[PDB]
Amino acid sequence: GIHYIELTPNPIRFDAVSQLTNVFFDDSNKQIFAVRSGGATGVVVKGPGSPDDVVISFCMSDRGGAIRSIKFSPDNQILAVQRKENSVEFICFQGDQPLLQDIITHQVKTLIHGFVWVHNREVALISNTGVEVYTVVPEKRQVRSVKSLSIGIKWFAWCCDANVALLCTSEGNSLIPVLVKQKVITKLPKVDLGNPSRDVQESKVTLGQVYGVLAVLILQSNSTTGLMEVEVHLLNGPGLAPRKCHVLRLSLLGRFAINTVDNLIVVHHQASGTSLLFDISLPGEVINEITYHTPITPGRSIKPFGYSTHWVLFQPNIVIDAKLGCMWFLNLCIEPLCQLISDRIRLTEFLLQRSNGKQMLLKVIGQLVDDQYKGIFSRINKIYASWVQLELQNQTAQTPPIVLIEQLDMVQIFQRIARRPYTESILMLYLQSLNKFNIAAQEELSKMIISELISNRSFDTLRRLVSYSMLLESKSVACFLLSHSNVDTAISQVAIDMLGRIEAHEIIIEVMLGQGKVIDALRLAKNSMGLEKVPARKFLEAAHKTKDDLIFHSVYRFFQMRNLKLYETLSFPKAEQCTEFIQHYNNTFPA
Partner 1 sequence: QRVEITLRSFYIFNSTFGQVEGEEHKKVLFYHPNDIELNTKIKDVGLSEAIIRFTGTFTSEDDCQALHTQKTTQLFYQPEPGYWLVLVLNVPKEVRVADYRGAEISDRIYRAILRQCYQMFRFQNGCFSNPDKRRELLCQKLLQFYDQDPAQCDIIDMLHSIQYLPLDKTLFLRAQNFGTLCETFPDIKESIMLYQEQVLCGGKLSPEDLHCVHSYVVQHVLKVGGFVRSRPMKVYVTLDKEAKPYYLLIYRALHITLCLFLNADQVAPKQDLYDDLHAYMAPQLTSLARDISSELTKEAPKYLFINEQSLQHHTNFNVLSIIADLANGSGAPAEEVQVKTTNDYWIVKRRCNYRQYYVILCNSKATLLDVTQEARRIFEQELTDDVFFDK
Partner 2 sequence: LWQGQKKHIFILSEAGKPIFSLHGNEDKLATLFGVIQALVSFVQMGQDAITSIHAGGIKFAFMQRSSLILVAASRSNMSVQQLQLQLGDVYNQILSILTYSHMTKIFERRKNFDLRRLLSGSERLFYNLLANDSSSAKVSNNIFTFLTNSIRVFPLPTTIRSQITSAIQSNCSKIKNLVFAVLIANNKLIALVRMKKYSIHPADLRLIFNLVECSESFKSSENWSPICLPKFDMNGYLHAHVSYLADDCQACLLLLSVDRDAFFTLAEAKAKITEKLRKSHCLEAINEELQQPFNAKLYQQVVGIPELRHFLYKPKSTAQLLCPMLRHPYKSLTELERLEAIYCDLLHRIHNSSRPLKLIYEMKEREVVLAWATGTYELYAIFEPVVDKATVIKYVDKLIKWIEKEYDVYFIRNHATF
Contact status: 435 vs partner 1 (CB under 8 A): yes
Those residues whose C-beta lies under 8 Å from the C-beta of residue 142, and which sit 6 or more positions away, are: 104
Among 262, 443, 497, 576, binds partner 1 (CB under 8 A): 497
Nearer to partner 1, 161 or 520 (CB): 520
Those residues whose C-beta lies under 8 Å from the C-beta of residue 195, and which sit 6 or more positions away, are: none
Contact status: 554 vs partner 2 (CB under 8 A): yes
Q: Which does 199 bind (CB under 5 to 8 A by kind): partner 1, partner 2, none?
A: none
DSSP reduced 3-state for 378: helix
Q: What is the DSSP string of 524-543?
A: HHHHHT-SSS--HHHHHHHH
- Nearest approach in angstroms of CB 559 to partner 1 is 20
- CA-to-CA distance for 108 and 126, rounded, in angstroms? 12
DSSP secondary structure letter of residue 382: H
Contact status: 174 vs partner 2 (CB under 8 A): no
Q: Which stretch binds partner 1 (CB under 8 A): 21-29, 231-239, 306-314, 486-494?
A: 486-494
Q: Side-chain half-sphere of 284: how many Cα atoms within 13 Å? A: 21
Q: Side-chain half-sphere of 517: how many Cα atoms within 13 Å? A: 11
Those residues whose C-beta lies under 8 Å from the C-beta of residue 288, and which sit 6 or more positions away, are: none
Contact status: 372 vs partner 1 (CB under 8 A): no
Nearer to partner 1, 280 or 495 (CB): 495
- CA-to-CA distance for 153 and 118, rounded, in angstroms? 20
Q: Which stretch binds partner 1 (CB under 8 A): 153-161, 244-252, 286-294, 463-471?
A: 463-471
Among 93, 153, 551, 581, binds partner 2 (CB under 8 A): 551
Q: Are strands 122-127 and 112-119 parallel, antiparallel or unpaired?
A: antiparallel
Q: Which does 56 bind (CB under 5 to 8 A by kind): partner 2, partner 1, none?
A: none
Q: Which stretch binds partner 1 (CB under 8 A): 45-53, 109-117, 179-187, 489-497?
A: 489-497
Contact status: 550 vs partner 2 (CB under 8 A): yes
- CA-to-CA distance for 315 and 306, rounded, in angstroms? 21
- Nearest approach in angstroms of CB 384 to partner 2 is 51
Nearer to partner 1, 393 or 425 (CB): 425
Contact status: 285 vs partner 1 (CB under 8 A): no
> What residues pair up with 319 in beta bridges, in sequence order?
313, 328
Q: Which does 121 bind (CB under 5 to 8 A by kind): partner 1, partner 2, none?
A: none
Q: What is the DSSP string of 271-293?
A: TTTEEE---TTS--EEETTEEEE
Among 419, 457, 533, 547, binds partner 1 (CB under 8 A): 457
Query: Rounded to 5 degrees, what angle do the CA atoms 89, 159, 200 make?
Result: 95
503-533 burial, b at 16+ Cβ within 10 Å, e below that, comes to eeeebbbebbbeeebbeebbeebeeeeeeee
Site string for partner 2, 493-532 (x = CB under 8 A): ------------------------x-xx-xx--x------
Contact status: 475 vs partner 2 (CB under 8 A): no
Interface residue list for partner 2 (CB under 8 A): 517, 519-520, 522-523, 526, 549-551, 553-554, 557-558, 561, 564, 589
* Footprint of partner 1 (CB under 8 A): 375, 377, 422, 424-425, 428-429, 431-432, 435-436, 456-461, 463-464, 468, 470, 489-490, 493, 496-497, 500-501, 517, 519-520, 524, 527-528
